[PDB]
Symmetry: D2
Subunit: 343 residues, 4 copies
């Protein structure tokens, strides 16, 4: 099967499988896993931050960041189509007792003036705005790159008000590859960044949160509370090091395959916009087709293509390491045949 559902389905490379077998391990509860310790040291250095914390998931990364940044009844400004709001189970409410303050954005880019206006005045009736979250790349909009200038402007606003800044940088390396902006440079405008090892960088498990020592110390106690305090997790960290240090550059190939796929899908007759394709995601609309997104997902699966429907009329196609250029070509031959059928 050709799996275009998500970059989450990436499997470990042979180099990672080997590194996991030979991993040097220890009890991370005591700070004694040498591989964890090295991955964290590396993550911290790559983002120009004092400290780093490995977590079993990006959700946990964001949720411990929120905890470490907030007090009960605080408010978090985030983009209205962001993952923290949509896809993290209302955890910020339950775990941290904080309210989201959604601001609309153009492809993840909140207008700095709208962020300015979402910030609470000091008044008894109002929660305290203590955190602003920015997502790069932006997922719901189709893997779009927030301009560095937006992040720089929003950062400045936050300094003026003493408000912390988090980048949900689940796909920050995809952002860096597309934009040319080094991740240290995005990171410098943030108090904390969460990034995933387990999507396009192909590690089997986990993400990392980078930040200041005192922030990470708090986040590490948050992690213990939430159940992220693992033992000999250096098995996972071994894959994690290879993800971080060796698997970034080739993300360029995911973007090329995605753009190649979109252009060719448009030639066939599918309703796609290749000019919208900036990273590893292609949005496919089904309005011109005889079945909706859900029916077309089934027709694709029967022909050996996996994809998800994100609404009744939209499918998302996501490239990653485990879909090669050949697989893209194979998929296109299938998409051609299914156009003769469902157009």
């Amino acid at each position: 099967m050709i799996d275009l559902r998500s970059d989450t389905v990436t499997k470990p490379t042979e180099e990672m499988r080997k590194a996991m077998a030979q991993a040097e391990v220890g009890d991370d509860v005591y700070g004694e896993d040498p591989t964890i310790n090295e991955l964290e040291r590396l993550a911290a250095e790559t983002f120009g931050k004092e400290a780093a914390l490995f977590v079993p998931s990006g959700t946990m990364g964001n949720q411990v960041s929120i905890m470490a940044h907030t007090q009960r009844g605080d408010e978090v400004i985030l983009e209205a189509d962001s993952h923290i709001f949509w896809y993290e189970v209302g955890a910020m409410a339950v775990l941290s007792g904080v309210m989201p303050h959604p601001v609309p954005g153009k492809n993840g880019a909140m207008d700095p003036d709208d962020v300015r206006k979402a910030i609470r005045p000091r008044n008894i009736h109002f929660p305290r705005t203590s955190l602003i979250a920015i997502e790069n790349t932006h997922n719901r909009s189709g893997g779009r790159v927030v301009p560095l200038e937006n992040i720089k402007e929003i950062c400045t606003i936050a300094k003026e008000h003493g408000i912390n800044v988090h980048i949900d940088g689940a796909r920050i390396f995809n952002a860096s590859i597309a934009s040319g902006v080094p991740v240290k440079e995005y990171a410098g405008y943030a108090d904390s960044v969460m990034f995933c090892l387990s999507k396009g960088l192909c590690a089997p498990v986990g993400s990392v949160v980078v930040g200041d020592r005192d922030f990470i110390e708090r986040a590490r106690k948050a992690r213990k509370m939430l159940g992220g305090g693992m033992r000999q997790a250096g098995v996972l960290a071994a894959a994690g090091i290879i993800a971080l240090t060796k698997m970034v550059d080739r993300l360029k190939e995911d973007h090329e395959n995605a753009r190649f796929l979109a252009l060719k899908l448009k030639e066939i007759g599918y309703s796609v916009n290749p000019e919208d394709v900036k990273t590893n995601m292609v949005i496919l609309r089904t309005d011109n087709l005889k079945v909706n997104a859900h029916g077309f997902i089934e027709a694709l699966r029967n022909s050996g293509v996996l994809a998800n429907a994100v609404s009744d009329t939209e499918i998302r196609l996501v490239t990653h390491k485990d879909v090669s250029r050949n697989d893209i070509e194979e998929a296109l031959n299938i998409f051609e045949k299914l156009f003769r059928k469902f157009s």
Copy 2:
């Protein structure tokens, strides 16, 4: 001072004060205060509900309702400019562990189709939508009346999905006076209603929640936890009975004073919409003025008029029993003079 900040500043009538001194009381924790019991019975009867619960504040009313309607990790659909989101201290997050889902509206009226789209599908990544809140009158937009048809339609959608509906009817008798829709009719389209006694109806303290007996039982236990479990509160209920049964018709005097104020403010040259004024509120914009809202609020204070800024460019003027037509005329002389200064 001519106090246009809010209708909360209403002081008790002479009859209220007499009834409070003479109040037949008991220990409400044992259900033994007869005057609370009677107020409750009356409020439930007037809204066409099984039961009612006295609370010390409208905020407590809304929050015990949220608690009684929801579980930890649920989502609450509400209007993007509603009081529960803006002026209730992030309590829904702290107290109930729930996420707000702000939907934009037109003067408090959320488009039913947007309410339908805000409902979370059943998926592991998603909170459960268990509550839709509707505010009538809608404060932020200028004490606007939400049309009945809007409330009926949203109620129809909630029924279809098994979602509770709550009305924040802090000023529901104002709505009813302007609209001619009885409060029993509004309430038939909701599972619960909070209404205030301490604003336009002139009681010194508190509000009531009305709904089913099992819901009210849950809300009564919540009230206990939150600290609204009082003792001989029949003192307060005695005024609240007078507020409910004697102070509703004269709200129309407040509507008239507000409209008159608006009409005269427009003729001076201020940025007001007298056609939008149908209850006890006027939104004044500072966009044609030399100072912003906060500068203009200081100037009014300095000449003897109290009002609140609701943004950097908008001021809310609220009428009530303690501002007479003479007071409004006196305030118009002052506004006239400050228009010379700041236009």
Copy 3:
């Protein structure tokens, strides 16, 4: 009915009823109720503290104090039979995200060495101990007075660890009338104290939290969140001033009545300990009777005497202004008939 259930059932004096009706009020949200402001100023003065906050209940008192003293995940040391653990609906967990750390005491008095041992070391696994609560008088033991020297030593321990101290002083004036220790001496060894107006001091509604300015400001925003931010609450504070300033001395009568009640009960043959009775409560054991605590409560009620069982073998009798000596003597005649029946 002779009501020995609790001191909560106290009803307002004529003087209080007149003061409520003649109360000078304003909007407490704006800090403009002059009678609330005077009550607060007086409560602060009396406790030798810089600031005070009126609340609708003592439960809200304790809970806003916990909120203002704590962060999510902290731990609060309290006596194992204290009202905060037993009678406040699990609120500290819900509202503040904090764990109770029960320590056994001897009549409310926790052994300081045990308090020392319950303080958590700094360890990722451990919540931070940020608060120690002491209840005086201690209710479940029979209105027992905690020694000043106990509070003094626990205070010293707290200062070594940087831990806050809250006295649940619901009945601190009973303590003070019994011991001769002024409430400002108890409170000089604490950061905050909550005391009740609505129990033995006879106000219809409310309690007060005293403490430092910063702490009270936090407790005031917490109160807003919980729904205790009332409007023209001067009606209640009028009676509150009379309670604080005029109803304290006469608590000695309640104590004399409780003592007479215990001596006479013992002389009839009931299992009471008059040597334990130093305030307004008597614990009576049902061990020499043919019924348990609950069956005796029923027998009593059918003969016109109201009390509460606190276990299967114990009833608590409570004196207050609305059980006079005649009432105690009438009650004793009934208790004598029932001892013939049940002994």
Copy 4:
């Protein structure tokens, strides 16, 4: 390398067999329920405990906390033993995450008197939280790995049934209990709604634990796991090791028991305050009451002579045996304990 580590059974390292299995693991995206190695671990765990459904988690702390969440509403009370791990060593999570209050009940070596549990249940009254969960820990860590009898658990189950209260067993070391008692883990679990057990302690997996229970409960716990951040991707890597832990590493817990008993009996002969009669699984409590140092001073003296151990109070030390401490290591440590006894005695 090259200290004798008696601090805990958490410190166990994977076997060669486990390392090969992880590296070679068949994986998928567990968010989709498509990791076949995870799926098989859960199938096997559920079956081993006589339950419909199982859920892999990254920590026992997560196992417990998703169980509490799945069992409770905000404001509820959880009855548990006063020295239980959920209370002491889980960072206040039950309060923050579930908004519930612990109701501590003192136990006798892990075992709460049934009637004490019954009196801890709240009546229906406005002032009281709802008692919705009773938690039982087996083995009980803090009393020295003590085995809660099956009959205690049976009786508590019966009380709970009568009041409609859920029962969670924190069986972090439930196979240790099972090996000592001869009671199959399915029997312990038959008197419980849910059980959490660790794979990463004495069973030697590098990461994780499992929750077992009914289908509808496990579905609720799976959504809580997603909320807390335990929803992983290609976790079959970890579950490869866990299948080996569950299927090959249970019987040899007998050796850890043998080692702890030997250790305690020999420590008793030397003259240390230990109770060999209390040692039935993999732990020894040693008191410092007849020594010139407290627990902390003794831990440092041990560290200085090549032995790692943890103070559990100012006067007590807990020695824990596990796969990476051999009989020979125990003998070495005893020879040192003997010298140190002369020093501090």
